[PDB]
Design an enzyme around this catalytic site. Structure first.
Site, PDB file in Angstrom:
ATOM      1  N   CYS B 314      20.818  17.266   3.314  1.00  0.00           N
ATOM      2  CA  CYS B 314      20.402  16.360   2.259  1.00  0.00           C
ATOM      3  C   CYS B 314      19.819  15.250   3.226  1.00  0.00           C
ATOM      4  O   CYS B 314      19.855  15.140   4.415  1.00  0.00           O
ATOM      5  CB  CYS B 314      21.582  15.838   1.631  1.00  0.00           C
ATOM      6  N   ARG B 396      -8.358  14.976 -20.197  1.00  0.00           N
ATOM      7  CA  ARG B 396      -7.720  13.979 -20.420  1.00  0.00           C
ATOM      8  C   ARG B 396      -8.610  13.203 -21.421  1.00  0.00           C
ATOM      9  O   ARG B 396      -9.264  13.580 -22.199  1.00  0.00           O
ATOM     10  CB  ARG B 396      -6.921  13.065 -19.477  1.00  0.00           C
TER      11      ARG B 396
END
Ligand SMILES: Nc1nc2c(ncn2[C@@H]2O[C@H](COP(=O)(O)OP(=O)(O)OP(=O)(O)O)[C@@H](O)[C@H]2O)c(=O)[nH]1
Ligand SMILES: Nc1nc2c(ncn2[C@@H]2O[C@H](COP(=O)(O)OP(=O)(O)OP(=O)(O)O)[C@@H](O)[C@H]2O)c(=O)[nH]1
Ligand SMILES: Nc1nc2c(ncn2[C@@H]2O[C@H](COP(=O)(O)OP(=O)(O)OP(=O)(O)O)[C@@H](O)[C@H]2O)c(=O)[nH]1
Ligand SMILES: Nc1ncnc2c1ncn2[C@@H]1O[C@H](COP(=O)(O)OP(=O)(O)OP(=O)(O)O)[C@@H](O)[C@H]1O
Ligand SMILES: Nc1ncnc2c1ncn2[C@@H]1O[C@H](COP(=O)(O)OP(=O)(O)OP(=O)(O)O)[C@@H](O)[C@H]1O
Ligand SMILES: Nc1ncnc2c1ncn2[C@@H]1O[C@H](COP(=O)(O)OP(=O)(O)OP(=O)(O)O)[C@@H](O)[C@H]1O
Ligand SMILES: [Mg+2]
Ligand SMILES: [Mg+2]
Ligand SMILES: [Mg+2]
Ligand SMILES: [Mg+2]
Ligand SMILES: [Mg+2]
Ligand SMILES: [Mg+2]
Lengths: 464, 464, 464, 108
Positions: B314, B396
């Site tokens: 982690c 877009r």
């Protein structure tokens, strides 16, 4: 009666060595904000850094540029010794002349000099403007790069191009505030400083104030100059090198060997402390045991550097079969050194900022970086562009063929080192990691971080 | 005299941390059939779940849809807080309004409203039918989507389409059995509820009975509404957020920080417990040690969430050097919490159902899931079809070229997440694994499972 | 009307280029036994080799040692020019002096010399014995290494150690058979040769006869000395270099450029042919088209070297977009050169002995090897032993630490090249391949092999 | 060089320039290297993992350095081609010839 690992001697296998991957820092009660943590630490008994980091004395890591950048960033650099004594002393002089409160030995010219001569002097010392003096030593003017930028005739004498006296000057002992008020009022960048008889004795520039504002963490002595260290070996040539470096103005000497638990290294440390101790700190080379650290402390070392074959498959471990895991080595060396107030420098085996946090929690005061800094912009080597990427390389006369393939590829293309960018970004990332660790452990200072506790993890904890 | 791992302090290395891969559950004498095993467990001191699982407060895991699905499955969801206060409160309200024993704030309309208006209201509240009241406040009928389905004029008023009064209605206090009897007699889906003056005060549907029979494990309050949790931080904005979430009807507040062993977090827990402790359970943020859990318990937390860098590689371990193996952390937290009856929530490092069993056996009462639930249908994100497979993406105006390559491929192609399908199947798999563990250990309940024993295995046990 | 590949110009795409992998040699009627095939071929119009191979003029391939080995194996070597003129001429002198029918200018000493002086001369010239003359030049003895082997005083004069006159000598004009008989009769290895007045003018050794017997394929001139070539560029420095090389005794000059279809290259070839052409052969640098080869033939080249970006992914092709597949290039150059009897040298793109057979069958007379020889024992570079294997490396003063890691690993560990072993084995393997090709095609000579046919293969023929 | 020799007068580059210093994007430092990324308010947690990594770590483009170096390498290649083909100008380069190669010519 038998030892479970064999034989009858229980001290044959002295201990179990922990490396960085074996431990983690435990969270603890905390009122510490990472942005507000204090990362200042002792490099030696007399020198405190704002950032507890030092660049390694390797010829791929630290030269003048790296040392200057490290000192500005709040740490320090140690110049390597894989070069002649004169060049190393020149690099020390380069670092010490980078900035100051007042240039006490300004580079001056004469009115009979040519524009080419003063240009070459400026390029030699990387400066922009020179005061000019006569054959006695009276200040007759100042010449700056705005003067030469607007004069084309390179054969003109300085007297034709220079700005003649009277100059905006100030007398010895002028406060920095008054000198800055003068520099601001007259809208100039340089200010000669003369004695009671008008003889030039110093120079104050606004760039020093700008640098002081821009680098507030700079590691500086009483005169405002950047601190710097240098490595030496053992022997008589090493002694001459050390004396020359001390003359050049070095602040820290590191007796830098692979195995410091040796009578010659201890004698060198004692000799240096006796000769130049009152001026210069002496750091003793790499140990990995409590006994060696105690021997260095006994010899008078101002700091102790820890690490002997700390990498997992390092060459020492494979070829000689010798090593010591770094966490255990730091714990032992600190047990030797802490009662006497001698800082410990952790050298070798650091891959991530978490390792730095662990090394300081084990008892070290600073960390030496090394390979993390190998490919930065400030490290030695040339920048090249290969296959759409940047690399750093450590790179003809008889190849006059213009169409040959050696013209189509950059020099040094073999064994190039990946480019890392500016040193400041790397240092900032490492310090962010350290501040996160300090916040997690509730350590307001590095001295409190040195009291943190570990948890030992099994091999299952390393499986991705 | 020296510690075998170095130094002189025997508590410098505080303990040896075990992760999930370090242990296995030992078989024991059993009369337990996995199908008859009882998996119910305490989430907090006042809330008991049928399935001991909770979805993490991550913006890629839990929003209204996931919270509804988790509560129906027998667990609960905790709404993430990476969004404005108004949106989080709206998500709380969306969860609380999904089902009930009786709708106490029915969405009503007026006879003057056009069909498009009431249709928009239905789309806003995701419902099908609306009672209708006049400007005085008296119920004049009801309009349902069957009435709106057979109408071609969208400009018509409700008075021209609605089923007019008198309606099939009932008085306040009518039991569910009688309401179902009425809805069965007249073959309708909705039943308005009026008071002693004919004023609408409720609405009982048959979809509620259908939902109750279809989801018999649903986590519900005394009014038959699903339970939901929400996360808050520390500070003044956090206090305003918590008050707004309580007004929306949240059932659990989670003070959710990376490091709860902090005076600010403990103060927040105490303040919340004082202000709204009679209605809402307060859960304290992530700890990894016994002292931190004891501090949370003394602060008044109703449950304690465990886990600080529990994963092997982690980011906390790599960057900060900080972590705690999760089995040992759970054991320490349970040692602090069990005498006071405070449940422990295990949060992080879970990869399989066997890990859930191990964590519950270590002493935790519930497990928080996280990445296991990230790709499911109810999790946030959009379903896309790429290269013959399904994915979830977190996607877009000025690209108006109809033949451009961007038109040929879906938006969100980069950084997409694999699609896992419905949440119920994943939860069913995990619960099957847990039931198998309970059968092997002879644990008829979770409380008996918390007494089961481990065997520690070596690295040879992890080699495929 | 349009070209199938586009445009209106049918010569825009001039031709389809075949490389070595595109073709195979067809079997033909054959009475040739591979062991009896004749592999001799013309290097230039005046020089014929026993083995049709030449080592490349690269600084990792050919220096004196490689040139000697290649000449002894039946081919020849071309010395590289990436070094000062004096060093290249010294390497030419080393190659020419290696063996001869008679040393016409033996290294003589004087009776006053110390043993250190004669030993220094012997180690300089790599010889064993020196005749002695007086200050007038009269022969008064000879000193060999068997004499010095038995003398322990290093500071003795030669007159004490030399075998005094009269020696076993012979007169100028003595036949090789007579000198061999004299050496055999008197059981000695060296034989001075004197004129009628007794002045020394030669030396005959038995080692020369032994070498002639050991290397029967050696490439030699009329004096029994090995042939050697050297590369030069274009320019005034190149002209001075060429003149120095001709003085040193070079046999072939190779004007060595990446692109020989250039006016300067052709003028350099013409100038060299005018000046030193009656003694030395001049070879013209690399071409890839019929027109360029015709230009070189017109300029007066004695041989034409072929190849411009012949490798598939070579730097020239990737960076400049320029190249020519080698089989087609050889066919075109041979079409230009064969009517005038100018041999073609195939240079580059050769990976196996089959490629050599294909190049000779396409019409080339010799092949230049290059990378195949780079790692052999006779090539430049130092042999090192790393990780259980042998490598060749093209690799301190201030690093005096006896235990530092650099002392544990050999220098030059980076960029090392695999060690290939002795050159004779490589040449033997290549010649075996070529002889097998000649047996398959029924070619008793290289000139018959140049008439063999190819079959072109598709892509599927290269799929393993 | 091939495109110009085929008859084009200029070339439009695109992906060869996407990672340069002058191109749009943000310069970030990840895992000892420089990258370019085309990248909070409610994340007030000072010790969360998001504070430990740069923003935009995902979908990052490698960093190429100054544009001038890239242009200089490309122009050097073009000049080498012009030297090989005897083209003093681009208009003369547009008259240069090709050789077609086979599949074996692209086989390493
Ligand atoms: N001019 C000058 N600077 C010196 C000398 N020795 C060291 N320096 C340092 O060189 C730095 C740069 O000085 P200059 O090159 O004169 O710069 P400047 O013209 O004052 O300032 P800028 O125009 O802002 O760059 C300062 O920080 C000085 O402390 C010297 O002999 N002359
Ligand atoms: N109509 C309505 N339903 C509500 C409201 N608040 C919560 N609900 C719930 O919304 C759910 C859906 O109800 P409707 O949309 O009316 O469904 P229905 O037409 O009765 O049932 P089906 O035709 O079987 O889907 C029920 O479980 C209600 O408990 C509200 O204000 N109005
Ligand atoms: N002695 C000698 N040999 C020369 C000279 N120039 C070239 N050579 C050659 O060097 C080679 C080796 O000669 P020596 O070292 O004297 O050999 P040797 O002692 O006769 O023979 P071995 O004892 O069998 O090695 C011979 O092939 C000579 O032709 C020279 O000036 N003197
Ligand atoms: N002490 C001084 N008194 C008077 N004039 C001065 C003094 N120092 C410099 N000047 C003059 O002021 C002008 C500007 O010099 P200054 O050193 O401030 O700038 P510069 O370094 O040349 O400019 P820039 O940094 O913009 O390249 C010059 O004409 C210079 O001769
Ligand atoms: N309490 C009631 N009294 C009188 N009429 C009612 C009542 N509830 C519903 N209706 C009417 O009965 C009809 C059926 O509506 P209901 O709500 O049962 O189904 P719906 O949800 O509209 O249809 P479906 O679910 O089949 O699509 C509608 O015309 C509606 O207006
Ligand atoms: N031409 C000659 N006449 C007479 N004596 C000679 C002559 N040449 C050499 N000698 C002498 O004869 C002896 C044998 O030397 P020779 O040159 O034959 O062998 P070497 O090369 O010294 O020996 P080795 O090859 O075993 O190292 C020496 O003492 C030498 O001085
Ligand atoms: Mg300036
Ligand atoms: Mg300025
Ligand atoms: Mg309905
Ligand atoms: Mg229905
Ligand atoms: Mg001999
Ligand atoms: Mg012999």
């Amino acid at each position: 009666v038998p030892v479970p690992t064999g034989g009858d001697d229980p001290t044959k296998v002295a201990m179990l060595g922990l490396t960085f991957d074996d431990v983690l820092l435990l969270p603890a009660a905390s009122d510490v904000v990472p942005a507000t943590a204090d990362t200042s630490s002792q490099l030696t008994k007399r020198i405190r850094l704002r950032v507890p980091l030092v660049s390694s004395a390797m010829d791929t890591v630290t030269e003048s540029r790296m040392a200057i950048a490290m000192a500005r960033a709040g740490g320090m650099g140690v110049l390597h010794r894989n070069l002649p004594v004169a060049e190393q002393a020149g690099q020390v002089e380069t670092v010490k002349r980078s900035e100051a409160g007042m240039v006490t030995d300004p580079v001056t010219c004469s009115p009979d000099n040519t524009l080419a001569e003063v240009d070459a002097m400026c390029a030699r010392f990387r400066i922009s403007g020179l005061p000019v003096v006569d054959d006695t030593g009276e200040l007759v003017g100042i010449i700056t790069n705005r003067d030469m930028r607007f004069e084309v005739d390179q054969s003109k004498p300085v007297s034709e191009v220079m700005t003649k006296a009277p100059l905006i000057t100030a007398k010895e002992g002028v406060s920095a505030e008054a000198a800055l008020g003068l520099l601001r009022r007259h809208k100039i960048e340089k200010l000669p400083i003369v004695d009671g008889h008008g003889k030039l004795t110093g120079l104050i520039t606004v760039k020093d104030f700008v640098k002081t504002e821009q680098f507030p963490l700079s590691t500086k002595d009483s005169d405002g100059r950047l601190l710097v260290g240098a490595a030496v070996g053992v022997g008589d040539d090493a002694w001459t090198r050390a004396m020359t470096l001390v003359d050049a103005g070095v602040d820290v000497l590191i007796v830098d060997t692979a195995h410091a638990h040796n009578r010659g290294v201890l004698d060198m440390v004692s000799r240096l402390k006796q000769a130049v101790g009152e001026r210069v700190d002496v750091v003793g080379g790499n140990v990995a045991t409590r006994a060696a650290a105690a021997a260095l402390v006994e010899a008078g070392a101002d700091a102790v550097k820890v690490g002997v074959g700390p990498g997992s498959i390092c060459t020492t471990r494979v070829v000689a079969g010798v090593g010591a895991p770094q966490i255990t080595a730091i714990l032992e060396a600190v047990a030797a050194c802490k009662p006497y107030g001698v800082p410990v420098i952790a050298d070798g085996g650091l891959q991530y900022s978490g390792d730095i946090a662990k090394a300081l929690a084990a008892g070290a005061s600073t960390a030496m970086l090394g390979s993390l800094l190998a490919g930065t912009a400030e490290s030695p080597g040339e920048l090249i562009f290969v296959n759409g990427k940047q690399f750093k390389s450590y790179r003809r006369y008889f190849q006059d063929d213009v169409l040959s393939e050696d013209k189509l590829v950059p020099e040094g293309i073999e064994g190039r080192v990946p480019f890392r960018g500016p040193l400041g970004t790397v240092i900032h990332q490492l310090t962010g990691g350290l501040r996160a660790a300090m916040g997690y452990t509730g350590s307001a200072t590095i001295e409190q971080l040195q009291q943190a506790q570990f948890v030992q993890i099994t091999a299952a904890g390393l499986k991705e």
